[PDB]
Amino acid sequence: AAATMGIWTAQELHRIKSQSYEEDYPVG
Amino acid sequence: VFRLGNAYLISIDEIKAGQATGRPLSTRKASACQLAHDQLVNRLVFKGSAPHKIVSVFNHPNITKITSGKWIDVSTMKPETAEAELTQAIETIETITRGQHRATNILIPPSMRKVLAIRMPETTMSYLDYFKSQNSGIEIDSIAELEDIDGAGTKGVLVYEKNPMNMSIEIPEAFNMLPAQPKDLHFKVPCTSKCTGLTIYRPMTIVLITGV
């Protein structure tokens, strides 16, 4: 029940894309 | 005239988190609040409410209504009834109003664009081009609110003249946000506005074709 995991965490190899998407709700 | 309103809540920790992350919540909530009022106004104009006794555009008693043969029967499309019905509706306004008013605008569902695209039996131009050539001055446009006019799926077409002396929508008070009223470690921001609806002043300048 000890710790065996590797040196690098999962967040040091991860990319968040710059764009985000927003839904459109036309008034009419 | 009538009046509308809604509100929204937010806390202090949410404000501080929004400031420190570059993604505020207040702006999004206010945008939703304004969008709600705009959509309610649109619903009042195009559908009306029964308990408040508001009449929609399609339910005005003293307007001209014409039943039509299906422009698309089951699946077959009929280019030639559309032109006949449009010309008849154009003539009706001038005949009834005795020359004072003439049609300037047409509004069709966004499938009748496909209908009016078939090439004329002769030459290459479509029915739309010939209709515009022989009916110069009239502007054709399509909106998506004309496909479920009654609630059971029956499309309709409106031919009318646009002039502030024949029809009008009024908003005596715009969207306002009252100052926040704090509570224990959070707030409450109310919003309100006013609206009237659509009033037809000379109900002989609008022709509705039902069943297209």
Added chain:
Amino acid sequence: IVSVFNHPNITKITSGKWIDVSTMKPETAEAELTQAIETIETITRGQHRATNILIPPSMRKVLAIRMPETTMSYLDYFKSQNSGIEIDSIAELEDIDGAGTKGVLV
């Protein structure tokens, strides 16, 4: 890994054969292309409009039949009324499911 044709959340349209046994129907192709163009615009509500079409390299032969009593062809009229869209053919659409089922991408 999901392929282009096997993705769950995409719009799929079942079509009547453009060439049934051996007879060619050059009028169903235009109707189906117009319907497929309309669906994208209606669902995305004006933000997104179709710009490209990819057909099998034999429906390219299909869309070359001349108008019954005109100088133009069906492709020319379709392009004239749908300006902005480019049509191209790739050989990868002649077998989609692995048992001989052609397809078109809009």
Added chain:
Amino acid sequence: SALRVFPVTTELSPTDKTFEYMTFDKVGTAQIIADYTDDLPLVDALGTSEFGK
């Protein structure tokens, strides 16, 4: 023709193993009210995200 008919992007560095993109939307309503009102509709918001390999 996989590369020609579909766009090619160069965001990912060689050492990445995953990537993520996020979306948002909104929810709300409104009603016809009279003066001296304490019942007023409310609005909110919500997001989500997805990954790749």
